[PDB]
Every structure is written in structure tokens, then in C-alpha cells.
Amino acid sequence: PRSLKKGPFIDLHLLKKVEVAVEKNDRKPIKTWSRRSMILPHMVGLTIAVHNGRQHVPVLVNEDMVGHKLGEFAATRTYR
Amino acid sequence: ATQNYGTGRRKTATARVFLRPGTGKISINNRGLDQFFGRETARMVVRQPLELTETVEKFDIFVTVVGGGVSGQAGAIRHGITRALIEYDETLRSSLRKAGYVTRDAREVERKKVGLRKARKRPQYS
Amino acid sequence: KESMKNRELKRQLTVAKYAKKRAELKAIIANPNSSAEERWNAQVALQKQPRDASASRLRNRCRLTGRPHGFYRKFGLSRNKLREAAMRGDVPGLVKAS
Amino acid sequence: VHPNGIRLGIVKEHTSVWYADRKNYADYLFADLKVREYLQDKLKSASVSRIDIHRPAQTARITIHTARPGIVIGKKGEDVEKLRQDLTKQMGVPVHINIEEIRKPELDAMLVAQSVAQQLERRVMFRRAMKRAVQNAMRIGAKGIKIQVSGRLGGAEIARTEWYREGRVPLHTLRADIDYATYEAHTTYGVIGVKVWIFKGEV
Amino acid sequence: RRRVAAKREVLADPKYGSQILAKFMNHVMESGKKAVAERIVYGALDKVKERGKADPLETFEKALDAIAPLVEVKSRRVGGATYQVPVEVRPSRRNALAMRWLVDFARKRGEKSMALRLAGELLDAAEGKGAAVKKREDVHRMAEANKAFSHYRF
Amino acid sequence: IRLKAFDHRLIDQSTQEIVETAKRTGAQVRGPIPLPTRKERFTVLISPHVNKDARDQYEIRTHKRVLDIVQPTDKTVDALMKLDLAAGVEVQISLG
RNA sequence: AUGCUGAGAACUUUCCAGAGAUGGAUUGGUGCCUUCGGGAACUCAGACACAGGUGCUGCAUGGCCAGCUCGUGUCGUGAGAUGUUGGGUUAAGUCCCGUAACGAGCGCAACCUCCUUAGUUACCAGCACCUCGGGUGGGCACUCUAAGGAGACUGCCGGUGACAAACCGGAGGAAGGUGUCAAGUCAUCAUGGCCCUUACGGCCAGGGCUACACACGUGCUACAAUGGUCGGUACAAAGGGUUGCCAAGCCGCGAGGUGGAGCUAAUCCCAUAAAACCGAUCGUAGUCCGGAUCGCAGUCUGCAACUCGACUGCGUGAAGUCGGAAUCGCUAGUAAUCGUGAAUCAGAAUGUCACGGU
Predict the structure, then answer these.
(1) What DSSP character marks residue E33?
(2) CA dihedral (C67, C68, C71, C76) positive or negative
(3) Which residues lie below 8 Å from residue F56, measured CB to CB, with a gap of 6+?
(4) Strand D191-199's sheet: what is its strand order?
(5) Under a CB-based contact definition with an 8 Å cutoff, are residues C75 and D32 in contact?
(6) CA-CA distance, F55 to F38, in Å (whole number)?
(7) Residue D176 Rama label (left phi>0; alpha psi -120 to 50; beta)
(8) Which own/partner pairs from A49-55 qualify as long-range (CB within 8 Å, at least 24 positions apart)?
(9) Whole domain around residue D200: which residue ranges?
(10) HEC secondary structure over chain C
């Protein structure tokens, strides 16, 4: 599975400091309180940090991303 | 008349012989023996009682018996040759002990045992 | 433990707390009759409307003991009951045969 | 492996004979728990051997096979509604309560096992009394009683399977019946479970 | 120590009319199908003589001449060197090594016709110049140093 | 008539009160149509230590019976619906 | 889990600082028994006390091949021994006869083909008919899977042996002799010496458990030749089935989401299938069995698939060559290669798989 049976992503409560923050300039990182929470495919180039409990990682996002989770910026098991 | 009821059984069957006298004609499961079967040797294993009771000229045999596998109730044609004929007469009574093809073998797949692999096929130990 | 056996047991009246919006929003999604403008209207459904409306975090246990393993569909009880129920006679029809 | 799960049929009877449908099989299995937990800690007086729980026409059926009516029954139903209310409010269905007569009650095993936990906590002797539990209940009727005592018996490191046996009790066959009364309680130190294997006559 | 088993040979072949050959479907049955086995139980015996000039029961019977041994290879203790046991034995021993090892050289030929790569060795015993005949003459002259050990230290 | 009953011993004693008490009233009711043992094997664990070599066998039976009344007027099916149970028999009825 | 006191009983608390709970605007309600006194449940709440042991600890706190012990009696100064040795036999402390021994409990041994009445709705042994798939009466006899049942022998003759346990042989008849090993849990019911005692009574938790650098408990699968790639055969097919199982699919090379024959299943959804004929071109290969990071990307749970998932379409990127040093281990139904359908009512529970037809 995980095909494009779900085409778009219209999620209302994961949104109200994201879609409104287009007119506002990009000076602060958008902090996230999940390992799941995603955002639009038309906003491409924001910053989301991997949320688990101790420290944050470098997150670099370019224009060409379509596929899957945020689990690559910090790893699943990051080789302690 | 000669309108009787015999029964061969392999793998929990209930057979139907529509038996009558005749001249050695064989048939099985609404088919002939040259009609459902072929590409086996199990057809004329039943020949071994058949030619020794010398009934190859006297009877018409149609033992419908269904179920089992490919050559499983090829083991039922073994049984039902003389059941519906010794309910007629007593000529071949003591002359069939040499073959011995009536006992429904209870050494088939009985109850399922846990811990083992199969009925009494034992697993790997040390 | 005391603050565990009475905080996830209350999911009987909180997961189906709404129970009428939860069926009026989850059948016509399986129908392709929604229009191309109407991908969004059926997605104001159940999450920020406080998110005890899905059921991915409930588990089946025993009643008097509370063991999740050994639980079957034919009981509300578990594996440490069957040896000690039908001999005192707590289960009907459980009879040894072959 | 259990012996007491075999005789569900041609010798004794089920105590839960009730039916709902194949998907409905566990609706009245919710009410089959809380009744036995009220007779263990509270109604130790007039102790209980076997409880029949059935679903007859339109309510329920629970029969409490005690020994002493004079402590329960008083002045034409003063506690009959007190068992009818305190039980059936957590039970899903209400119960009309009948009381039967088990005159000469010394031949149930639970009517002996639930009388020794009242005797072992207050320093009454652990060796003379388990003898006399079956010295005076063996005049008329039963032919033999075994009591396997593997337990505490004063000393904390004891696995001595004691030999308080009196008579002939085979406990492997089905026509010679097996009784099994494993009550457990808390004495002043050491966990002691009272086990009773009274053998009545066969057939 | 008592022998409790009862020897029950069952020999009745449906078409072939043999004497000792009938029930042999045991290593022709490779834990598989009987309908695969139909050109190789008797259909391979209908494939031996197709280049030859006889009946296939002629050549089969005479395997009890030169691929059947004379002495036996079982090991025995006295107080020293482990002595094997040479003796004239009844046919159930020596002819047991005249039928099952004759077919056991079937993989180092690996030719066309699965039916032929089982029974393409049986006709070589007319003079007895095949594969199982080499080891039978090895037995007799690896029994010179043993043949006096039958009563004395045996 | 179709029921929903337990086993061998509570339908073979529940159909004895049906057919004779329906033949008394001048009607014709057919005889009992059999049903064999409901074969289903049950496997659980019994060992105090976790053990894969220890399973066992159990079963719950489910036996019902086919009957039918030729001239449907019987009070044996409605008035003797409350009689044909003892402790937990649930007698379904059919007007056949 | 708490005793005393509360506005408003409880609800609604959907919506907003939540990118992430709620306190609250809480969008409305006064409820509830009537000596018209009184009373009580709760979203949260300010005092006192605690509940939590989620480190330690199986050491004063686990109970569910066959032989071992008691009681009585003896001999022995006693510990202890006889019973239980022996002789003939036994799967056997199974016995027969001897024998200062005699009776016991335990393990062992045993316990878990014959049938009245039968088939409302399968279908063709009675038969008309049939699309010869049986629409259907009739299938109770030439039956459709039985609830429960005389059930299998020391039964018998004869040669051995003390005639005796047994052991050898024959019946009939297409069936005849079977109480043990100072070790995993003060933790699924239990229970200690110290502890957290503005606390593991606070929880929306600001992520840091696989550098390949090995031996291996190794234990399906082949030895390239029966030769290298499919949509086909006489062909599986019912139950749980009132918040379920999810047609012929229109979709298909192979996806049977809208469809829905079956909605309480002698019905059916995975419903399709069995290693057979002579299967093709060519007739015996570490390779035209070979794809491990570069499937990108395709209207199905549905508010939660922004550099990772079934869908195997085979353009590619290999290590499978008689198992030898030595050892898993096979004396009879056995060494042995056709699959699981169903929840507290939402369907990827793999070495011990409902039937391995050999």
C-alpha cells in the first residue's frame, strides 16, 4: 500500500501556524510535537525538527521531495 | 432378486453397488474402469481375486465409491469385489484368506498430537 | 498499580463518546460520489474535535485478572480461567470428546 | 491434567447451563463472576459448597447450597431481599433465591475446607486437629478420606507431603468420584491453603 | 532379545507377470507422484528390451550371479582387533546387495529420458559387465585375511 | 421446527416432550432428523512455565434438529415452549 | 483510593492562545425525593493524610528408564537389615513356585463391526423430468458426514517348563492373540531489612539503544540438464457470520475500492485450483534458475504516507559441483515436498498448518 489513494493533504489543526505563515517572513523554526506531523506539498523549503525528547538535528529541505516520512533528517536508530 | 447392497470404504465412504450377474463387466463411479482411470497400474490389482474366484464370466460389477485422493480409493477397489457376492452364496468363503483385502486399515492419519510434528512422526531432539 | 487500571478502561464511553458523528463521517468516504471540490468538507471530522475519536489504542484483556494474552472471542475471560471454570462449572458446553 | 473436567455429562451436572447465540455467547458470562466473590470474604458463616447459575424464563437463577439456615433465615424473609439487592445490582439480571435442605452436611468437601481456616489462625494445634477433622465425620456413610498435606505445618522450609490418610480413596478413576476443595487463607505467618479430598461412595 | 516382526511380502503385479519384482515401488517413488511413476515402474521395463531381443524378466532374474556377494561385512569384538564375519549366508542377505545397489548408480549417467536413466543399467548383466559387478569381486579378495575367523575368535 | 440447543443430552430429552404431546391432539408431526457431532478442536496452554510443547484438547458441541408440522395449528409449539426448557435451553420454534 | 466544605447536579466543554491537553466565552437547561424542612451524584477545586515500590531480594514466604516407602513381626548390642533375596518369567516391584516373613499404599497395569427412527430447503440407488447443473413431488429400502451403543479374547485344544507364570503355534474367516539435580519471580494470588517521602501524587516528555571487526544450536530448499519463461486438465469450496464475511467484477497481463447472487447460510466472499497425457525451438551450463543501495510512482483505512512497502512486468549487479575432518540420527504405517476459514463484532499472527492420497 501507501499509494496515492490519498491525493491531497487537507489537515486543519496541523495547519494554523503554517498556511497563515506564508505572508510572514521565515525567521523562526516551526517546532513540531510529533514524529508523524507533515505539511503541504506547495510550501516546499520549511524546517521541521525530529521530535523525541533531548536535542535537535540539522534539517535541510530542497525542492524535490514527494515520498515518505520525516525519518531521514534524524534517523530511526541514529547509531549511538 | 440380485438387487443388493454392498459397500467399499476408504476415507469414510458409503458405497453403492448396483450388482447383477453377467459376464465380467467392470465399472466404477458412474464411469467405466477404462473411462475414469487409466495412466495407472491400480486398475488390475483387483484382477488378483477376480481371476482366482473364476467370476470373470459370471457377474457385472459397478462399485461407486467416492472421496479420498488420486490413488487412495484405488485402495477401495481392493475391498469391494466379494462383499456383495458372499451375501449370495458360500462357494468362495474360505478360498479368500490368501488375499486378505477387507480390513479397513486404522493405521491411517488418526488424532492430531501436539508437541510432535504429525501423528507419531517425531521432531528434532538432542 | 492503581492509576493504570482505571484510565484506559474508561474508553468504553470516550472512544464512542460522540457515536453519531462517527458514523455520519465514515461511510461516504468509501463512496466515490464526492465531487472534485468536495475533497475537504468530509475532512473536518474527528481530530481537533478532541482526538479520542479513533480506536488504535485499545486492547482486550480479562475481567477479574486483567491478562491480555490468552483472550479469545468466545469469552470475556482468559487462559488462566478455562482450567478453573468449567470444573466448578462456569462455562456451558465445554465437554471433552474426540 | 484435570480429572474434574471429564465428568461433565453422564455422572454429575454442569452448574452453568444457559445459552445465548454464537455471537451472543458472552453476554451472560459477564454476570458469572461477582457472585462467588461475595461468599468467600463475607458469608463464611453457613459456608457454600456448589452454586448453580442458570438462565430460566426472563430473569436468572442462583441457588446457594449452604448448611445453616438459622443464621441466614430469620423471621420470614428479612435477609432474603438483602441477598436479592446486594448481589443483583452489579449482576446484569435479578435472581429469585430458593433455599434447600442439606441435612447431615458433613459429606461435602467445601463444608469442611471452609471450616479449618477459622481454626488455624488462632494457634490451635496443626497436628491433632487434622486427624480429628476426619475422626468424627466418619461414623456413618463414607468409607475413606485422604488429605494430602504438602505445605507449611509450623516450619517455613517444609516440602513434607504429609500422610493424613484414613481408608481407601482412589483419585484417578471417574466412577470413584474425586472431590477438590482448595480453600486458601492467611494464617499469622505462612500461606496455608486448606485442601480437602472427602471420598463418598461410588454410584 | 526376540525377533517380533513377521515377514510379509506382498507380490501381485497387474500386467507384468513377475515373481519377485512387483512391490518394488519404493525408491522409484521419490516421495512424489504415481502418475509420474508410470513410465518408469513398468514403462522402463518396456524400455529396457526395446533395443534388445528378449523378455525383460530374463535379464532381471540373473542379477543373483555376480553382483551378489559371498561373505558379510559386520564387525565383531573379541578382546582385540575388530573382526568381520565371513560365512556362507542364506539368499536374503547376499541378494539384498544384488538389487538395490544395481539401481543406485543412476546419477552419474544423467542422460535423456528419466525413464531410461533408472533402467539403463539392468541389461548390462548378461555377461555382468556393469557398475555393481566391480565391487562384488572386491569382496572375495578382501576376505582372504578373515576367512579363518568363523569359530576361533568370532 | 428448528431449535438452538446445547448438545446430545438436552435436545434428545427436549424433543421427547414435543412430538408425542403434539400427536396426542389429533395432528401429524414427523420424526427426528439427525445431526452429528460438531467437530471443532480447541488448543490452549496449561503449564505454569511458558512452554510450547504443552497443548491439549477441548470442544463445545452444538446440536440442532429439523422438524416440521404438517397441519399448522398446534398449541404444542406455543404453550409448550415454556415447558421444553429446564435450566438454560432456549427453544426457538419454526412453523413448518 | 480518600474524610470535611462549593457556585453550578451531571451534559455541552465542538470552537480560540493548542504548530500540543484544557482552565474557560462555556453558544441552551434546573434539575430531584415534596412532614414543602431536608437530601444527594459531578468539569475543576483550597487543607490534613496518603495511595505509587516502575531498583534490591527464590536462601527464615511457590502449592496442583523404572523404582521408592509405611505398618506389623522377627533376627541384630545397635545403626541397620528381612520383606524387595533366590529359581523359573515379565513393557514392568509383571508374576508362578520356593522363602521369617505377612498384609499394604504409591509408579507400572486399567481409568479419559450391532440400531429402531432417521433427511422441511442437498439431489436421482425408486424414477418421470432436467440445461442428464437435477426446477421438484419421491429419495425412510438398491441411503446423505451418526447421539448413543453387544466392542476385540489368557478365549480355547496341543508340544516345553515344577505344569506355571508366561513363552512358542491353530481358530473362525476376503478381522485375531496384547521418589529424584544449595541455580529462572520478595513481580500476574502472594510477601521482607532500606528507600521516592514539593515524590516514579506533574506530565503536553527539549532523543543520543544495529561502526561488520567473528565463531556460530549447525536443523526446507541443489548438485544446471528432464533441459531454461505460462493465462490451460475428470478438480478445492463450508461455517462464526443483527458495529460482520467483503460476488461473475464493469477494473484485468495480475489490481475483483462504487458493485454486490449469500444479510442469520444441506447456500456462499479468499470460489480459482489437484505433482498425468507426447508438452513446444534446441536434446547433458557456476551460466538465457541469478536482479541485495539507483519502483520511481498508480480515483482503496480516511482530517495523520513532504529524499523508505504489498501490487514480483523480469531491461539486471555473482559466490547452489557427491557433504571428506566426523557426527543431528531410521527395525512399520514408518525415513516422506498439495493450504488454515472466522475479533472486545475493521480480514499482511511462517521451522511443530484443519487432508501431505506415497
Answers:
(1) -
(2) positive
(3) B114, D1, F43, F44, F46
(4) D161-166, D144-150, D191-199, D181-186
(5) no
(6) 21
(7) beta
(8) A49/A73, A50/A74
(9) 104-203
(10) CCCCCCCCHHHHCCCCCCCCCCCCCCCHHHCCCCCCCCCCCCCCCCCCCCCCCCCCCCCCCCCCCCCCCCCCCCCCCCCCCCCCCCCCCCCCCECCCC
Beta bridge partners of B27: B62
F40 CA to chain B: closest CA distance, Å?
12
Q: What distance in Å separates the CA atoms of residue B70 and residue B79, rounded to the nearest whole number?
A: 17
Q: Which fold has domain F1-96?
A: Alpha-Beta Plaits (3.30.70)
Which residues of chain E neighbour B73 with C-beta distances below 8 Å? Answer: none
Bridge partners (DSSP) of residue D191 are D186
Q: Which chain C residues 42-71 have CB under 7 A to strand G?
A: 42-51, 53-56, 58-60, 65-67
B1-126 topology per CATH = Ribosomal Protein S5; domain 2 (3.30.230)
Chains in contact with B, where contact means 3 or more Cβ–Cβ distances below 8 Å, are E, F
Q: Please give the CATH topology (third level) of the domain spanning C1-89.
A: Helix Hairpins (1.10.287)
At residue D150, the 3 state secondary structure works out as strand
Q: Which residues contact C29 (CB under 8 A, 6 or more apart)?
A: C42
Residue of C nearest to F44 (CA): C79
Q: Do F33 and F18 contact (CB within 8 A), yes or no?
A: no
- B46 close to B65: Cβ distance less than 8 angstroms: no
Nearest residue in B to F54, CA atom: B115
Interface residues of B toward F, Cβ cutoff 8 Å, are 112, 114-115
d(CA D53, CA D13): 12
Q: Would an 8 Å CB–CB cutoff place C70 in contact with chain F? A: yes
Neighbours of D178 (CB within 10 A): 17
In angstroms and rounded to an integer, the radius of gyration of the C-alpha atoms of chain E is 19
Domain parsing of chain F, residue ranges = 1-96
d(Cα D109, Cα D199) in Å, to the nearest integer?
A: 9
Q: Solved by what technique?
A: cryo-EM
Are C63 and C57 a contacting pair, CB within 8 Å? Answer: no
C-alpha cell at position D95: 435472581
Interchain CB contacts (distance < 8 Å): D and F: 32
The answer to whether D156 and D173 have CB atoms below 8 angstroms apart is no
Q: Which residue of B has its CA nearest to E9?
A: B99
In contact, E99 and E89? CB cutoff 8 Å: no
Q: Is F84:F17 a contact under the CB 8 Å cutoff?
A: yes
Residue D2 is assigned to a structural domain of this protein? no
Question: What residues have CB less than 8 Å from D157, skipping those under 6 apart?
Answer: none
Break chain C into its structural domains and give their ranges: 1-89
Q: Cα dist. E38→B40, E11, F54 in Å?
A: 6, 18, 44
Query: How many inter-chain contacts (A to C, CB under 8 Å) are there?
Result: 12
The C-alpha cell that represents F55 in the structure block = 497443548
Amino acid letter, residue D63: T
H helices within chain A, ranges in order? none
Find the nucleotide nearest A33 (Cα to C1′): G20
CA distance E72 to E87: 7
Identify the residues numbered 30 to 89 in chain B whose C-beta atom is closer than 7 Å to any atom of strand G: 30, 36, 39, 49, 68-72, 74, 79-83, 86
3-state class percentages of chain A: helix first, strand second, coil last, to nearest 5: 5, 0, 95
Number of domains in chain D: 2
CB of C92 within 8 Å of a chain F CB? The answer is yes
| φ, ψ (nearest 5 deg) of residue A68 | -150, -160
Q: Exposed e or buried b for every residue in F49-72, given b needs 16+ CB within 10 A?
A: eeeeeebbebbbbbbebebebeee
Count of domains observed in chain A: 1
Phi, psi of E65 (to 5 degrees): -110, -55
The answer to whether the C-beta of B124 is closer than 7 A to strand G is yes
Consecutive H or E run containing D120:
helix D117-120
What is the bridge-based pairing of β-strands D144-150 and D61-64?
A: unpaired
Q: What are the boundaries of each domain within chain B?
A: 1-126
Alpha-carbon span B7 to C21, nearest angstrom: 65
Residue C78 and residue C69 in contact, taking contact as beta carbons nearer than 8 Å = yes
